[PDB]
């Protein structure tokens, strides 16, 4: 019942000094050796340190780590803050034949500014209707932050069964993009007069709205 | 040097049995006294131990994942492979076969993570449909199109514009799983209006797991 404790959000500036730490809970941090692993996103993760003060050959001599035993918490010392330190890091136990991970900090560097989020709508298609299928695109683009409600309407009815959307992603020009998607029987598409896509962001609200033609 | 190379199937289905498979290339299985294990990374989440494994038969488990590890080792093939039983939707995670020099100690190498995901449904092909720009799809002196990719199984699906001619303004979403099993995505482009009736844009979208190939013309809406 031995668990690694880590703080999952750790963000600094570059340049500057930060602590990360890894407590244990019942065995003393001094017991076992404490592996620390830093991980870029989509790669395999990479020994930064290890005997919890000894550097691998490979890696800066800034990844100092330091054990405080009394408060059965094991430190790793981070100073010169760049770009490419950006990556998770888990530290490693070994308790008695049951390897233990730790719970993982981020290394933050501590980015475009608010950017329009052009709304574009499309009605489902004939090669759709003729499979017995409906479906009701809304694509979010060019925006920031990355944080945009939607909510689709028939005529005056929100709708809400079927909708289905997706996490904003960066784009390549710093900005996010986003989509939402409304699965919809043939028969309902053309029951209501029209049906509507509203876009809330930062306040402002971008609607456009689409018809059965 | 020395490199771990994982194998097996991509996809596993729930309450089956997984048969993931990491094979050595520059060194020996037996020689060296050296340890080998198994540990695995959900998306999002922190890595997990799963067990690790010598050349002879000493094995040794998680207590949240024992009575369902089976690891062996072949030295003929100088590889070794880890079957799971009872997988399940919670399973899905990054599976990593990293060298452990010392036991207690660092995994000097790791291996390239496969990517293993729990879904329950049959291998279906994607369903493609045009979507066509109008008068509501542009927004000032430019316009809108893509292609739409409902109800397929299993990630990923790449889409191609004009054979990969087009890539400016070319925006592929992230998958997003529906209601009832499959995903759905979407990529669109941004194209100036004036060319709507007068260049044609053919999206190329390929599911490679079900092998099923769709190429889908994207013309402007016509009123009926």
């Known amino acids: 019942n031995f668990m690694l404790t880590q703080p999952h959000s750790v963000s600094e500036s570059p340049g500057k000094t930060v602590t990360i730490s890894c407590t244990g809970s019942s065995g003393s941090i001094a017991s076992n050796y404490v592996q620390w692993y830093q991980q870029r996103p989509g790669s395999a993760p990479t020994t930064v340190i290890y005997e919890d003060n000894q550097r691998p050959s490979g890696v800066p001599d800034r990844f100092s780590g330091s054990i405080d035993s009394s408060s059965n918490s094991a430190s790793l010392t981070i100073s010169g803050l760049k770009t490419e330190d950006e990556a998770d890091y888990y530290c490693?136990?070994?308790?008695?034949?049951?390897?233990?991970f730790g719970g993982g900090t981020k290394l933050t560097v501590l980015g475009q500014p608010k950017a329009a989020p052009s709304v574009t709508l499309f009605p489902p298609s004939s090669e759709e209707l003729q499979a017995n299928k409906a479906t009701l695109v809304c694509l979010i683009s060019d925006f920031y932050p990355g944080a945009v409600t939607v909510a689709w309407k028939a005529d005056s009815s929100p709708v809400k069964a079927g909708v289905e959307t997706t996490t904003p992603s960066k784009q390549s020009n710093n900005k996010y993009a986003a989509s939402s998607y409304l699965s919809l029987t043939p028969e309902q598409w053309k029951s209501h007069r029209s049906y509507s896509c509203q876009v809330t962001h930062e306040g402002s609200t971008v609607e456009k709205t689409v018809a059965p033609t | 040097q020395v490199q771990l190379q994982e194998s097996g199937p991509g996809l596993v289905k729930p309450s089956e049995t997984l048969s993931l498979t990491c094979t050595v290339s520059?060194?020996?299985?037996?020689?060296?006294?050296?340890?080998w294990s198994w540990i695995r990374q959900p998306p999002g989440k922190g890595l997990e131990w799963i067990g690790c494994?010598?050349?002879?038969?000493?094995?040794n488990y998680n207590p949240s994942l024992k009575s369902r590890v089976t690891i062996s080792v072949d030295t003929s093939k100088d590889q070794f492979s880890l079957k799971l039983s009872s997988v399940t939707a919670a399973d899905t995670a990054v599976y990593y076969c990293?060298?452990?020099?010392?036991?207690?100690?660092?995994?000097?190498?790791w291996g390239q993570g496969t990517l293993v995901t729990v879904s329950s449904a049959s291998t279906k092909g994607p369903s493609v449909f045009p979507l066509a720009p109008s008068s509501k799809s542009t927004s000032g002196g430019t316009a809108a199109l893509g292609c739409l990719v409902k109800d397929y199984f299993p990630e990923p699906v790449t889409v191609s514009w004009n054979s990969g001619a087009l890539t400016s303004g070319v925006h592929t979403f992230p998958a997003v799983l529906q209601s009832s099993g499959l995903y759905s995505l979407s990529s669109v482009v941004t194209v100036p209006s004036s060319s709507l009736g007068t260049q044609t844009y053919i999206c190329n979208v390929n599911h490679k797991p079900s092998n099923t190939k769709v190429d889908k013309k994207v013309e402007p809406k016509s009123c009926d």
């Open positions: 990293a060298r452990q020099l010392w036991l207690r100690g660092r995994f000097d190498y």
């Open positions: 490693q136990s070994y308790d008695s034949s049951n390897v233990v």
């Open positions: 520059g060194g020996s299985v037996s020689s060296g006294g050296y340890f």
């Open positions: 494994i010598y050349y002879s038969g000493s094995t």
